[PDB]
Design a protein around this nucleic acid. Structure first.
Ligand SMILES: [Zn+2]
Lengths: 1362, 260, 67, 99, 68
RNA sequence: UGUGUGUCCG
């Protein structure tokens, strides 16, 4: 059928070089590309038949030859395009509007009901709630435009298929605007009377293309003009419209919840900002993004100006103002703006400057940077920018390099000594280092303040290697489904033959990592190390290193590099070795908030050789990559080589990059002056160069971060201060602790801390400049209580909310493999959960998610891309049209039962659920109780068991045997395995994937579940360390639909084509849902009656399933209660007696958990009115011998032996049980590993597997501001009713409940002082200590695995013993 | 007869004992001289410890220095000869001294390579950094005027002329930084921009008892659409603090003033 | 008288010889003490100078193939 | 008994004479050793201070050095590394800066 | 008489034999000062070599650095 | 006829 699948969201940079060809075929004129070769080249076979197309000729009949650039017209199209015309799609997206709104309202009701059932709700509720929501949704500004743009996106996405001959076009006429689409090309016909004019009488869009007299005589008596663009601009416009709609809707809805003050800025100011930005862009072209880019620093400065403002808090805003004024002055002198336009163009940054908002609103506004679009990129300008900063001559100071190297060595030695016991047996003539010999003999380590005169002594230390090269425990890093560069022989084969002007003599076989990985006969870690050691990357055919322009940004262009396959493998191995080896001596601390740290611990840490005040400053880590030279990084690279046994591995980049020819691998424009004769030695010009001395972004990041940490440590040593550093993304924050005496008040303390931070910043700037990397003092700011870093922004210890960046990204369409509905709904649910993690409001995010869920369902039902046009999924799968009630019912039963529901209200309290089945059952019961259809619970939850296998049970330990709750992962895994069977001549993969692999896997999983009683989590944990786990982790590498439908090895296996199988499975899955009454049985339905206990319902539901696996043996460690159903709240008044603890606690009493409120306020911004705005006080088995640098296989074997020994304690067959699991891992023998195995001594293994091993971190799903003002007492439970109670989840539930209950009321209005959590006597039981007993052995031959790839560990005892 | 021989043998033995005792006495004198000459060699520990320390330090420093640079260190004579023609810097690194290269840069006689000039200037421009003047911005007249315009709503009002005259007077008196700091502090503390300008013209000592500048206009056309209400006849003895911001002068003996 | 004189002479000779054995033994003990005293420090000095010479020679050997 | 007494006395005096001669030889060699040991002590004492001051001056002068990077460092390092293992020139064509 | 004379002669012979054995023990123990004498010459030669090599290193430093 | 137009390190 086809091998094409166009993307639904923007994922590529915008390049318009090819459009220059299109306008040449239609007889127009356009100047997009800076390459003259495209002006007089040969047109492709397509986009040349356009002159034979009658529709295009009719379209272009009353328009001038002249055209206009598209980047001047995007805001105009955005403003002047609403849905009122005629569109070819038959079911319009606007038709099914009302139903969506209806669904939204229902969801709101449910949430309220759920809250009222929990006991949180609110106080003094208003009757006018639904009407306000209806008015807000219906009165939105960007409503109809969203539907129109989605219709356009559907049309252009469907049109991009049909790569064969006889292609067709589509036409849309919307009043003023005309649109013609043809195979990834769009023509826009627009009136001229709506374009901004010059002082010379021509539009601003024609300034740089035409002279003043040429354009005037070109237009003549014409009213409409044509612009040409690609299909990416339409997707970008659709994304912008969706984001604006989401932002406006959320801002409008948030006012209803909190009429007085809300954390979202407004819905009137943001519209003005949108209009101002649109006008600025329409005037200035693509150069307006230089001004748009200043939205974030201005917001940061305005947030910074919400404190005491001593001296330095006004410097950053002044610098930003001066910079934006200079930028606006420089890019408008050539353009001939009218005085009115000149006055109007500054309104954007004038409104930005004069804003008056609370810090929360500014932090929310910080996240609308990408709501205006993205610039148009050119290869030439990006290459010229990269060429600078990468060829300049630097000046360095040798003494600073020497000191940095010494600090590097000292840090590594200190990290080795802190763990591992003692020093690392320094060899090599110890008398050369007088001063360290005493410490070595006494077996101690110098503290820190005395390390200033013996620093040079660290240069002479020598030692054996400390880290191992056999520590790779994840082979999936070597096959990741990416694209690489080609060999030097066929370097120019990645360009179009027509644009090039000649047929390249040589062609490549493939360009993808997974296809090249399976054809390498001699792949191995040792082979890669030998390849690196012999300097094989200097071979003449292994020097290409292409470039690629990065995705959506706001710069003139940033690039990343691509290397050939073996050098890519060398890079990956180096990164893995550095990650698991070094770089643990230079960690990233974080959690450096002084106000949220223990005073005694902070004072103890701040000691170098009493109140402690700390400041901080942040520096940007962007241009460091290009500013690294070999003269500075040579000693560190040599030391890294010496710490391992390698010879020439870690300096692969610095040796081969300068020998490469640099170019950007763009399809439609090759480097300038490329001809057949000068093909072996091409010339360098505007888009190429030869000598590259700096680094490349992304490569060798860990080494550079380690060097930066070493520099910071040297600065800390030089000046007697205490420094803490953190690095994330493209920046690093450094905080300085000052420590002060007692009687020094609190006014000059901040000034002194700021002065200390400023002097530290000056010293660091001097050091880094001496190292060859230059900071910008203009862009470096020093503050005392504001730290922004990654995903966390704190102002004097108060966390600021940022939830728009995730909530505004919700959309009906996303890449989920063949437009899977379950994937889209899961993505929407995850986005909703992440958004509700921040902020304090609840309703806007849930309303947005409910709005988008139904829209996605309908748009997938009617306009699926995998089927032919005019196809209805919901018609034939049922035989009757899909009604609203069926969809509403099928969107309510949770996913663990196979029911397409992902918006669990329980997620509003804590992130990780103890038991998905119990929570889902409780939610379904509550939903059915709300409506008057309570007599559907049993037929809904009965269902029919599926035909699964023990492999699936091991993979999902807490699931059910139903076919509707399964993903598409199994299908892809089977496809990959089938492909590997007829392919993969790797000669080492074939050994792993032998003929009887599936038999071995099935036998292992069957044996692991043959104990008594049966435990699922233990089996799942153990199964991952067997070779079956390695095979499974290799199998799952497919990520996208394009690689599924376009791969060569996958689609060369003949058999049934993939598209037909995908259609069949999609039809089956759609039939599984939305049907009901057809996949149920009455045998379990009668057996689940009169239970009235969710724990029991879950237990019999689990036991009835997996019956073909669990014959009659009990199942343990899988069922936990729902914490919503386990506790009840009373909300005691300040002066009263609890009815439960007094009236009904005479005989024995009732256990409970107490919650009380603190009174100290510490800090509050901007006021103490809201609890979220204030913070308070109150923090939220040894072995006999130890190996030295153990390998990955040895560690896995030790862990497996420990687990097997500890679980089976009541038996006496450990020696015969652990034996078959170690023959395939290590060369050692049983009773020798047991010496290394710690003597585990625990009780009731279920508790250790629930919280001690920590399958999940639990954490919390609310902001941490309110957790510091509450004290929770749990010792009142007495005997703790060990038990099924998870204490961390109890604390999280109490804190989240208190936060949700009081979120719109002022602090003084709260009339509740303490809360009692009283537990029921139905869902809480006693768990006794139990152990697993095995009555057989694995009795399988696992000795055939004698390959060194990732399985076998010949000679484990290489590094010695402790 | 044997008595004489016995006596002679005894005398000979006694004499031989005498010179062997003398020999032992001389031997022990030689030994005593041995430790006397050996004593003054043990005092070199203090010297040799420091010698070892400084030698090891120098060894480490220069070993690292030679290891960082490759095999093309480009000795000084080679660099000097290479600068003469095709004055680009030589391939491979090179070594200079701070004073030598500074004096070379400061003298426009020997045609130092350009790239070396920018490299050394960039390296040396960061040595003048203290805790003060680290992030201190440089403010000129035009920049401050634009900053003050960006806050005032509308256009063509009298506050624009007040900003202009304030900027001119500050430039004349070289006190722009104090004016800007006061403006920013007043605006941040809560007052409106107009109030900030009022406290500026009322609080700065240089703006006390000063005659407002007089400008000349040809006719009523120079008067903006937002200044007609502020036009007033000039009273005697104008005061800058009273509300004088400018003086409009005409050729035909006409003077007008503006009041907020 | 002659026998008594001979006995006295022999006794005096024995006293002198045993006295000079005592003196020689004391000198031998003093020499051994002086030797053992002057063993560790000078040996440490020698190895330190040897190591310094070796490292300096290695540095200069690395420097020669540069000019 | 006179002859045996004379012979014994002669043997005893010969032994004492041999002891005296070997003691004198030991004294002579000890004096020679003392002269050889004390010959260069003054030179050592004078030279140690010269080395101390030279090393201190070199260390002080090292702190006033400025180095500028070149465009042929990585190529030279790669050539040296390739020559140090299976010593041969790297395969053609020539590298970026072959000089 | 004669018995006392021969007894004194025997005692003298024994003490002379003891003198000879003590002298040969001293001569055996004296052949160890060369262990404590060659380090002086070794240090002298190594200090001469150190002076030469440090002078060479300084000369290289003047040749390499541009200096004044 | 347009080799999968593209979509890397973490
Ligand atoms: Zn109670």
């Amino acid at each position: 059928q086809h091998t094409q699948y166009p993307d639904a969201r923007l994922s590529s940079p915008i390049v318009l070089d090819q459009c220059d060809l299109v306008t040449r075929a239609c007889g127009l004129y356009s100047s997009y590309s800076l390459n003259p070769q495209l002006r007089n080249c040969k047109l492709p076979k397509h986009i040349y038949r356009l002159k034979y197309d009658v529709t295009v000729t009719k379209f272009l009949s009353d328009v001038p030859v002249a055209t206009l650039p598209i980047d001047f017209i995007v805001p105009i199209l955005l403003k002047a395009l609403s849905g009122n015309g005629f569109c070819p799609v038959e079911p319009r997206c606007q038709q099914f509007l009302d139903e969506i709104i209806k669904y939204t309202m229902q969801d709101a009701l449910f949430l309220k009901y759920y809250l009222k059932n929990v006991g949180a709700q609110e106080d003094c509720v208003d009757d006018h709630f639904q009407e306000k929501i209806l008015s807000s949704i219906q009165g939105n500004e960007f409503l109809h435009q969203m539907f129109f743009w989605y219709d356009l996106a559907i049309l252009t996405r469907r049109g991009r298929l049909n790569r064969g001959n006889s292609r067709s076009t589509w036409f849309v006429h919307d009043d003023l605007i005309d649109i013609l689409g043809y195979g990834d090309y769009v023509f826009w016909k627009i009136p001229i009377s709506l374009l901004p004019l010059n002082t010379q009488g021509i539009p601003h869009a024609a300034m740089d293309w035409y002279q003043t007299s040429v354009f005037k005589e070109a237009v003549q008596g014409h009213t409409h003009i044509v612009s040409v663009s690609t299909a990416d601009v339409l997707i970008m416009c659709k994304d912008l419209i969706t984001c604006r709609f989401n932002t406006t809707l959320i801002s409008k809805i948030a006012e209803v919840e909190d009429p007085v003050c809300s954390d979202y800025p407004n819905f009137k100011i943001v519209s003005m900002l949108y209009q101002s930005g649109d006008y600025l862009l329409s005037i200035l072209g693509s150069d307006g993004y230089k001004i748009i880019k200043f939205l974030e620093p201005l917001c940061l400065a305005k947030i910074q100006l919400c404190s005491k403002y001593t001296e330095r808090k006004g410097r950053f805003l002044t610098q930003m103002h001066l910079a934006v004024n200079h930028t606006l002055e420089e890019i408008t002198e050539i353009r001939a703006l009218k005085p009115s336009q000149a006055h109007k163009i500054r309104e954007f940054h004038r409104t930005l400057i004069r804003l008056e908002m609370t810090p929360q609103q500014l932090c929310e506004l910080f996240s609308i940077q990408k709501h205006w679009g993205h610039p148009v990129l050119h290869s030439e300008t990006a290459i010229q920018k990269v060429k600078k900063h990468a060829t300049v001559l630097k000046a360095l100071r040798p003494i600073v390099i020497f000191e940095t190297y010494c600090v590097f060595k000292y840090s590594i030695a200190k990290h080795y000594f802190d763990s591992q016991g003692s020093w690392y047996s320094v060899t090599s003539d110890r008398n050369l280092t007088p001063g360290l010999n005493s410490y070595i003999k006494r077996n101690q380590f110098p503290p820190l303040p005395m390390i200033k005169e013996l620093l040079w002594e660290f240069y002479h230390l020598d030692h054996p290697p400390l880290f191992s090269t056999k520590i790779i425990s994840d082979l999936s890093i070597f096959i990741k489904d990416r694209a690489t560069a080609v060999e030097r022989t066929c370097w120019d084969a990645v360009f179009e033959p027509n644009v090039l002007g000649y047929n390249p003599p040589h062609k490549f076989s493939t360009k993808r990592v997974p296809e090249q990985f399976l054809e390498q006969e001699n792949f191995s870690i040792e082979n890669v190390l030998s390849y690196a050691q012999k300097l094989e990357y200097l071979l003449p055919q292994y020097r290409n290193f292409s470039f690629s322009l990065k995705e959506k940004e706001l710069n003139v262009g940033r690039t990343f590099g691509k290397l050939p396959y073996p050098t890519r493998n060398v890079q990956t191995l180096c990164e893995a070795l550095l990650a698991d080896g070094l770089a643990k001596a230079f960690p990233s601390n974080m959690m450096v908030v002084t106000e949220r740290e223990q005073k005694e611990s902070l004072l103890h840490q701040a000691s170098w050789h009493a109140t402690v005040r700390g400041s901080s400053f942040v520096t940007d880590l962007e241009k460091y990559n290009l500013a690294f030279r070999y003269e500075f990084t040579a000693p560190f690279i040599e030391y890294c080589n010496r710490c391992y046994g390698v010879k020439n591995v870690f300096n692969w980049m610095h040796y081969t990059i300068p020998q490469c020819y640099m170019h950007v691998s763009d399809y439609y424009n090759p480097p300038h002056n490329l001809t057949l004769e000068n093909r072996n030695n091409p010339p360098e010009g505007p888009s190429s160069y030869r000598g590259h001395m700096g680094g490349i972004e992304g490569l060798q990041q860990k080494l550079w971060t380690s060097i930066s940490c070493a520099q910071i440590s040297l600065v800390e040593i030089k000046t007697g201060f205490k420094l803490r550093s953190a690095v994330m993304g493209d920046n690093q924050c450094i905080t300085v602790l000052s420590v002060f005496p007692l009687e020094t008040d609190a006014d000059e303390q901040e000034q002194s801390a700021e002065d200390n931070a400023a002097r530290v910043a000056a010293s660091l700037a001097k050091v880094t400049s001496a190292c060859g990397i230059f900071l910008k003092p203009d862009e470096t700011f020093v503050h005392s209580g504001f730290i922004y870093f990654g995903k966390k922004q704190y102002l004097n210890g108060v966390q600021l909310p940022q939830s728009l960046k995730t909530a505004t990204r919700m959309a009906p369409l996303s890449d989920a493999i063949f437009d899977d509905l379950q994937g889209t709904l899961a993505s929407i649910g995850t986005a909703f959960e992440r958004s509700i993690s921040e902020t304090r409001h609840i309703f806007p995010c849930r309303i947005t998610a409910a709005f988008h869920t139904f829209f996605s369902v309908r748009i997938l039902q009617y306009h699926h891309l995998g089927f032919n046009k005019g196809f209805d999924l919901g018609q034939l799968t049922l035989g009757k049209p899909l009604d609203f009630g069926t969809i509403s019912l099928a969107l309510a039963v949770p996913q663990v039962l196979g029911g397409l529901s992902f918006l669990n209200p329980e997620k509003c309290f804590y992130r990780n659920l103890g038991d998905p089945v119990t929570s889902g059952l409780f939610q379904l019961k509550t939903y059915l109780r709300m409506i008057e259809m309570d007599d559907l619970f049993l037929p809904l939850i009965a269902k029919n068991p599926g035909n699964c296998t023990a492999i699936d049970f091991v993979l999902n330990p807490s699931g059910l045997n139903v076919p509707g709750s399964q993903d598409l992962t199994s299908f892809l895994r089977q496809i990959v395995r089938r492909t590997i069977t007829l392919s993969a001549k790797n000669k080492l993969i074939n050994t792993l994937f032998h003929a009887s692999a599936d038999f071995e896997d099935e036998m292992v999983c069957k044996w692991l579940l043959s104990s008594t009683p049966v435990m699922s989590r233990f089996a799942a944990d153990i199964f991952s360390r067997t070779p079956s786990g390695k095979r499974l982790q290799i199998l799952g590498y497919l990520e996208g639909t394009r690689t599924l439908l376009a791969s060569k090895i996958i689609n060369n296996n003949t058999e049934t084509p993939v598209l037909d199988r995908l259609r069949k499975i999609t039809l089956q899955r759609w039939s599984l849902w939305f049907s009901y009454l057809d996949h149920c049985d009455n045998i379990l339905a009668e057996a689940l009656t009169q239970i009235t206990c969710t724990v029991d319902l879950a237990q019999i539901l689990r036991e009835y399933s997996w019956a073909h696996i669990l014959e009659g043996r009990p199942l343990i460690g899988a069922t936990l209660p729902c914490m919503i159903e386990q506790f009840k709240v009373v909300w005691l008044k300040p002066y009263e007696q609890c009815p439960q603890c007094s009236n009904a606690k005479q005989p024995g009493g009732k256990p409970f958990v107490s919650v009380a409120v603190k009174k100290h306020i510490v800090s509050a911004w901007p006021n103490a009115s809201r609890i979220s705005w204030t913070i308070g006080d109150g923090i939220p088995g040894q072995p006999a011998i130890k190996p030295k640098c153990p390998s990955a296989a040895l560690r896995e074997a030790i862990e497996l032996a420990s687990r097997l020994t500890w679980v089976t304690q009541g038996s006496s067959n450990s020696d015969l049980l652990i034996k078959p699991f170690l023959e395939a891992r290590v060369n050692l023998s049983v009773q020798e590993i047991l010496q290394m195995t710690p003597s585990h001594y625990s009780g009731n293994i279920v508790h250790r597997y629930n919280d001690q091993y920590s399958p999940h971190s639990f954490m919390a799903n609310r902001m941490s501001n309110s957790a510091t003002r509450l004290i929770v007492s749990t010792n009142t439970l007495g005997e703790f009713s060990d038990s099924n109670i998870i204490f961390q989840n109890v604390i999280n539930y109490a804190v989240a409940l208190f936060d949700i209950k009081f979120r719109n009321t002022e602090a003084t209005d709260i009339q509740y002082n303490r809360a009692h959590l009283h537990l029921t006597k139905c869902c809480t039981r006693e768990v006794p200590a139990q152990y697993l007993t095995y009555t057989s052995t694995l009795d399988l031959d696992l000795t055939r695995y004698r390959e060194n790839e990732l399985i076998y560990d010949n000679n484990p005892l290489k590094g010695g013993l402790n | 007869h044997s008595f004489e021989e016995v006596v002679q043998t005894l005398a000979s033995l006694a004499t031989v004992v005498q010179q062997q005792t003398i020999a032992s006495e001389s031997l022990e004198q030689r030994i005593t001289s041995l430790e006397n000459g050996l004593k003054p060699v043990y005092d070199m520990a203090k010297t040799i410890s420091s010698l070892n320390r400084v030698c090891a330090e120098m060894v480490a420093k220069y070993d690292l220095l030679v290891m960082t640079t490759g095999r093309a260190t480009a000795t000084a004579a080679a660099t000097e000869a290479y600068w003469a023609e095709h004055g680009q810097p030589p391939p491979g690194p090179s070594l200079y001294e701070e004073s030598a290269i500074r004096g070379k840069i400061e003298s426009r006689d020997e045609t130092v390579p350009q790239s070396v000039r920018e490299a050394f200037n960039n390296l040396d421009s960061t040595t003048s950094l203290t805790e003060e003047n680290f992030g201190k911005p440089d403010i000129s007249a035009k920049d401050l005027r634009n900053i003050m315009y960006d806050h005032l709503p509308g256009f063509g009002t009298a506050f624009h002329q007040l900003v202009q005259v304030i900027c001119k007077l500050g430039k004349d008196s070289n006190s722009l930084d104090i004016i800007h700091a006061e403006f920013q502090a007043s605006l941040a503390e809560g007052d409106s921009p107009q109030c900030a300008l009022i406290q500026i013209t009322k609080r700065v000592p240089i703006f006390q008892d000063a005659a407002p500048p007089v400008i000349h206009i040809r006719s009523r056309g120079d008067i903006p659409r937002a200044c007609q209400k502020s036009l007033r006849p000039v009273p005697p003895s104008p005061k800058i603090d009273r509300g004088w911001v400018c003086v409009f002068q005409l050729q035909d003996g006409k003077t007008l003033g503006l009041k907020i | 008288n002659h026998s008594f004189e001979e006995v006295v002479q022999t006794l005096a000779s024995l006293a002198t010889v045993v006295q000079q054995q005592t003196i020689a033994s004391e000198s031998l003990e003093q020499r051994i003490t002086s030797l053992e005293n002057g063993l560790k420090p000078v040996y440490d000095m020698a190895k330190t100078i040897s190591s310094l010479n070796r490292v300096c020679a290695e540095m200069v050997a690395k420097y020669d193939l540069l000019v | 008994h006179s002859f045996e007494e004379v012979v014994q006395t002669l043997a005893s005096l010969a032994t004492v004479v041999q002891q005296q001669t070997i003691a004198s030889e030991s004294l002579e060699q000890r004096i020679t050793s003392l002269e050889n040991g004390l010959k260069p002590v003054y030179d050592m004492a004078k030279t140690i201070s010269s080395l101390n001051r030279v090393c201190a001056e070199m260390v002080a002068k090292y702190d006033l050095l400025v180095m500028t990077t070149g465009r042929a460092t990585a190529t030279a390092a790669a050539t040296e590394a390739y020559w140090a293992e299976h010593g041969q020139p790297p395969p053609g064509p020539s590298l970026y800066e072959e000089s």
